[PDB]
Design an enzyme around this catalytic site. Sequence first.
Site, PDB file in Angstrom:
ATOM      1  N   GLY B  36     -11.316  -6.905 -31.902  1.00 28.72           N
ATOM      2  CA  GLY B  36      -9.972  -6.816 -32.444  1.00 28.72           C
ATOM      3  C   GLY B  36      -9.141  -5.802 -31.691  1.00 28.72           C
ATOM      4  N   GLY B  38      -6.282  -2.668 -31.899  1.00 23.55           N
ATOM      5  CA  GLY B  38      -5.787  -1.586 -32.729  1.00 23.55           C
ATOM      6  C   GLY B  38      -4.853  -0.639 -31.998  1.00 23.55           C
ATOM      7  N   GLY B  39      -7.044   1.411 -30.482  1.00 23.26           N
ATOM      8  CA  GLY B  39      -8.022   1.019 -29.484  1.00 23.26           C
ATOM      9  C   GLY B  39      -8.593  -0.367 -29.715  1.00 23.26           C
ATOM     10  CB  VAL B  40      -9.251  -3.189 -27.721  1.00 25.77           C
ATOM     11  CG1 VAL B  40      -9.907  -4.561 -27.781  1.00 25.77           C
ATOM     12  CG2 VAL B  40      -7.748  -3.309 -27.937  1.00 25.77           C
ATOM     13  CE  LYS B  56     -11.799   2.153 -32.058  1.00 30.34           C
ATOM     14  NZ  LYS B  56     -11.917   2.094 -33.546  1.00 30.34           N
ATOM     15  CG  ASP B 149      -7.797   6.853 -39.299  1.00 26.53           C
ATOM     16  OD1 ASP B 149      -7.707   5.835 -40.013  1.00 26.53           O
ATOM     17  OD2 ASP B 149      -7.076   7.047 -38.296  1.00 26.53           O
ATOM     18  CG  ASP B 176      -4.467  20.310 -31.568  1.00 25.13           C
ATOM     19  OD1 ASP B 176      -3.782  20.007 -32.567  1.00 25.13           O
ATOM     20  OD2 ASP B 176      -5.381  21.160 -31.605  1.00 25.13           O
TER      21      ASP B 176
END
Lengths: 275, 308
Positions: B36, B38, B39-40, B56, B149, B176
Amino acid sequence: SVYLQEWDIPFEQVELGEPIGQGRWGRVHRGRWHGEVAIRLLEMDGHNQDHLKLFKKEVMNYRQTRHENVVLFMGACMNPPHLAIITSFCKGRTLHSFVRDPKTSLDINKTRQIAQEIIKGMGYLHAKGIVHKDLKSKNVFYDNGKVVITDFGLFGISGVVQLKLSHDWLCYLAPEIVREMTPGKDEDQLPFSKAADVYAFGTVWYELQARDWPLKNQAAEASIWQIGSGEGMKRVLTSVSLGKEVSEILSACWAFDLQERPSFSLLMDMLEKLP
Amino acid sequence: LELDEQQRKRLEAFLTQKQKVGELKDDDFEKISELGAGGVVFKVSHKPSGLVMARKLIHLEIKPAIRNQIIRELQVLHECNSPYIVGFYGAFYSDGEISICMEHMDGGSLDQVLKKAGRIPEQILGKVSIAVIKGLTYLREKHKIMHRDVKPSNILVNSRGEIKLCDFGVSGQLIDSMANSFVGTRSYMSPERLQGTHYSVQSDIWSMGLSLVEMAVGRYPIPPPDAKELELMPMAIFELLDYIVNEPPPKLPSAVFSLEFQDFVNKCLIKNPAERADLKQLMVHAFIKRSDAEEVDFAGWLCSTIGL
Ligand SMILES: CNS(=O)(=O)Nc1cccc(-n2c(=O)n(C3CC3)c(=O)c3c(Nc4ccc(I)cc4F)n(C)c(=O)c(C)c32)c1
Ligand SMILES: Nc1ncnc2c1ncn2[C@@H]1O[C@H](COP(=O)(O)OP(=O)(O)NP(=O)(O)O)[C@@H](O)[C@H]1O
Ligand SMILES: Nc1ncnc2c1ncn2[C@@H]1O[C@H](COP(=O)(O)OP(=O)(O)NP(=O)(O)O)[C@@H](O)[C@H]1O
Ligand SMILES: [Mg+2]
């Protein structure tokens, strides 16, 4: 199709040099016109979908411009779909990297003079009806006194390039824009205006004071609500005091109701009645 | 913790296979398919060693000097290992992008499972909660880290029936150093976090609660469906975010679900984080106690609804 022989500047040759950065608006190269220039290389998927018509309009609009505080727009050649925008090359450091250098010593006089120069340039642009979309500290150059504004009106173009946002950019985006932000929507649709530019000047004014941007790096979503609600700028305005005269214009530029934001001509006077 | 003996077993069988590789490089891997965007993340085959991993891809163009700081913070991740944490194989830099190769969980994400099933039943969602609660306790008690997350796309499943967390916040320098974050259409961030105020693991607790409602009903639950729309069962991001801050939180329908399930999520989605349940309170909730003692062959349900 517009070529280099239609331009104010006499054209004979132009050699590319080293690039100096990529962005969502093509690639910028250190060039050589007998003077160094900045060349921005673009590609336009808009297969004659009024994009070029608008591009010819906007580029011609950039023409007939000259001011000591704004970059000298030189040329814009288009061999579709490949386009290029040639600008005068600003030596020296960006205001971003300049204000964040430890050894730099800025005061209320140096700060005042800097802001005045920026307003003089931004005033010219507004007088010409040219809305400088994308004003930020990365697009302002300082060289031992000389101050120049860069990359104006670039967002009006619709060339090819989940939402894609930086943090340094959000601190300059006015609430009216953030609320209208939504996926699949392009930059041309956002409500940039003469008022939207003076908001971004406030974030610049804050950087001139705080030597940083208003919102410590957060998830962009946090920066969205804090900006779109107007509460975020209200907190950071209260969180540290600087001076009634200083805070006056920061509260002024960042006014939530865009009509409550001053014009740039008004800002010239506000910067005079200062320490 | 309250570690079982078999949990030690299945962890250890993986960590013997751990030493089966020493170094990593781009050319070791062959792209099997795309998972998928999003990263992939891509399914990849490792060739030096028979292990099959998930790779990823995060695209970054940044200077060498910062990278060594990211990697040394990132090396701590080899130390954490849990049946509730996806196993990690290594991290490296190559050609303008960090590749992360990790344990392949053959069931994918809860988003893609929900799409196929339509709705996720209450009893399965109970088993998922226990695994998540124990993972967060481990991170709090042993490493003092919050996830930051948690959401369905980062909850992975396998045919053995294990549930493991990924994409958690190990590197302070990487946060950061990541100048440019990307937002989409669904947000699972808690209200307190959205206002840029002080936050703790409590914001993760909200994300778990909100994630559960979505999966239970089959739709991202903000905005709530209307009366006539719940029987049958074009918005800007700031309108959604302002809903989270100012409107009442979503709740489960009161007809078709137990009070333990309804009360549990309600306690997770209290907007004031001081009143929101904490892990200690969550561990003892009636909904969790029931699920923990229930005998559900989760592997069988997964294989049978997804068609193996
Ligand atoms: C966006 N809101 S935010 O501004 O607050 N920034 C922020 C907040 C919360 C998490 C992250 N975050 C992250 O989203 N992802 C995903 C890429 C999409 C990370 O992978 C990630 C990360 N890698 C990582 C580590 C272990 C495994 I097993 C798998 C992984 F993918 N590591 C090390 C982090 O430390 C953080 C902090 C990550 C960013
Ligand atoms: N006329 C110029 N003179 C010198 N440097 C310039 C000039 N125009 C652009 N640059 C620099 O070239 C780089 C790329 O430009 P640009 O496309 O505006 O990306 P950016 O300024 O970094 N932010 P963004 O517009 O979002 O990509 C930046 O480092 C600019 O500061
Ligand atoms: N390790 C993985 N194995 C299999 N599928 C995965 C994995 N990680 C993510 N996916 C799937 O692929 C998509 C992309 O995930 P990823 O690029 O990690 O970001 P995300 O899961 O969408 N949310 P986030 O990681 O926080 O940006 C997800 O929506 C999942 O459906
Ligand atoms: Mg620029």
